[PDB]
């Protein structure tokens, strides 16, 4: 019975949180007025207008809506408990133990539908990982952190590949596109976008002098054979280079950004996967272009002597950096899914 | 004269958001039909919704008679479902025994103009598989 | 325009100057 009992107020507590992130009352409030407005028999002789104040309505009712079943589903399982304790019944208790499952289960989807907001979420993506100006230290910083991700990604259960790779001639590598898949994949990492700033003592300096280097990640949904929009034949250039023939690099002129693959045997193969890259990275700049349009770079922050993360936007630090470095920055990453930047 | 079909719950007293200017598009209030409704649910149990009879008169005293609970609803609470299916010839979500729609079919028998409740139930199970359960 | 944003001054490798060993040496302390 302990665990049951630790399940009723958990998932009330849980309740409560996702309440405040929400910050309902506005919500409330908005349903109020969509409502008078509906009931106001005037709106409806223009048809648009009167649909889109329909779809507003629902939406903000079903939430609330949800979070007022949360508030009342719990008080009535808090009761049922009540009862079965009072009168020494089995099956009562039972119920009472069981009945509660359903709504966390409820309270879970609820959150992880706020939580992935974007259109692109659920798609699998492209991570890319360039290494710093620096030299040979940003190469390894850039591996360390390929090395992290790829951990992580395996954790999660996701089936990554290398589209390019290319190495860095001490150590390291210079640079490295990644082709992570499966459910969700972009929703998670679409936050990690961004620099990330190494610092530690440089064991390939010959001295013990303390070295910063940084690293850009750049994450990008798969949006292949579902969007209208493509690349102009005259913009768009192919380049042929050799293996470490095969390879294929794409230019797009306007915009003035490139897309490789060398993963793929044949030449064919290869201009095909960078097409599909080079749109996808269009579509995600389009994206953001708008978002902008609705509406320093540098994200974490991996000292290593120290041996502190802080993840700068979110403000969330971990002494466990080797854990971290392991491919344990769930956290991190959930962190920053929750304030929604 | 005004007679339509279109309303949720009827433990949910005054539905102004879901249904709105279609009840009150004639000459009656809004405040009356909900009244009305009201009145109706004391004899039976809230939560499903109930469609009835709106025969809009001149004089704003309307006649209206209640028909049995929707089909939808009724067959979804022998089932115990709260989704039914997306897909359902793909994958199936849940099934149904046929005593059971027979049993829900009996208790419409007033509303349904028919003499037979085997074709009740054949429509039942009908209804059923469409929704997406293999009888 | 990533690489050209990796390539800001902003994003240079810094490096801590000494305090005790190579570059150690300070004519003037701190404070006096």
Not at chain 1, 75 to 85: N, P, Q, R, T
Not at chain 1, 199 to 210: I, L, M
Not at chain 1, 226 to 252: G, M
Not at chain 2, 26 to 34: D, L, P, R
Request: aromatic share 6%; glycine share 8%; proline share 3%.
């Amino acid at each position: 019975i302990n665990p049951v009992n630790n399940r009723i107020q958990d998932l009330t507590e849980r309740s409560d949180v996702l309440r405040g992130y929400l910050d309902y009352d506005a919500k409330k409030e908005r349903l109020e007025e969509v409502n008078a407005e509906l009931e106001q028999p005037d709106v409806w002789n223009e048809p648009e207008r009167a649909q889109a104040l329909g779809k507003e309505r629902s939406s903000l009712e079903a939430v609330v809506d949800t979070l007022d079943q949360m508030k009342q589903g719990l008080e009535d399982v808090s009761g049922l408990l009540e009862l079965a304790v009072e009168a020494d019944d089995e099956e009562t208790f039972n119920e009472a133990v069981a009945e509660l499952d359903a709504l966390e289960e409820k309270l879970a989807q609820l959150e992880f539908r706020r939580m992935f907001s974007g259109e692109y979420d659920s798609a699998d993506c492209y991570l890319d990982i360039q290494a710093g100006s620096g030299g040979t230290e940003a190469q390894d910083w850039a591996s360390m952190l390929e090395r992290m991700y790829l951990r992580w990604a395996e954790s999660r259960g996701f089936k990554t590949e290398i589209i390019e790779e290319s190495e860095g001639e001490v150590a390291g590598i210079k640079s490295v596109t990644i082709k992570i898949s499966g459910d969700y994949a972009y929703g998670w990492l679409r936050t990690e976008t961004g620099v990330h700033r190494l610092v530690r003592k440089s064991p390939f300096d010959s001295g013990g002098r303390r070295h910063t280097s940084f690293s850009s990640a750049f994450v990008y949904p798969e949006v292949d054979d579902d969007i209208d929009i493509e690349i102009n034949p005259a913009d768009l250039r192919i380049d042929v280079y050799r293996t470490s023939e095969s390879a294929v690099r794409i230019t797009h002129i306007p915009t003035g950004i490139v897309t490789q693959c060398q993963n793929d045997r044949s030449q064919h193969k290869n201009k095909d996967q960078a097409m599909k890259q080079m749109k996808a990275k269009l579509y995600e700049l389009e994206m953001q272009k708008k978002n902008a349009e609705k509406q320093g770079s540098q994200i974490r922050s991996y000292v290593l002597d120290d041996s502190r993360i802080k993840d700068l936007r979110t403000g969330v630090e971990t002494r466990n950096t080797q854990a971290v470095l392991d491919g344990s920055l769930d956290q991190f990453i959930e962190a920053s899914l929750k304030a929604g930047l | 004269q005004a007679y339509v079909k279109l309303q949720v719950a009827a433990g949910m007293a005054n539905p102004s958001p879901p249904v709105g200017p279609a009840l009150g598009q004639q000459g009656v209030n809004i405040m009356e039909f909900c009244k009305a409704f009201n009145a109706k649910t004391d004899s039976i149990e809230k939560g499903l919704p109930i469609p009835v009879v709106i025969t809009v008169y001149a004089d704003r005293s309307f006649t209206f008679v209640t028909k049995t609970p929707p089909a939808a609803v009724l067959l979804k609470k022998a089932a115990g479902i709260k989704s039914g299916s997306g897909k359902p010839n793909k994958d199936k979500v849940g099934k149904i025994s046929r005593a059971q729609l027979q049993e829900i079919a009996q208790t419409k028998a007033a509303d349904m103009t028919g003499a037979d409740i085997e074709a009740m139930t054949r429509s039942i199970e009908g209804t059923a598989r469409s929704m997406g359960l293999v009888v | 325009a990533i690489e050209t944003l990796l390539h800001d001054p902003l994003f240079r490798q810094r490096v801590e100057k000494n305090k005790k060993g190579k570059g150690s040496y300070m004519r003037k302390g701190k404070h006096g």
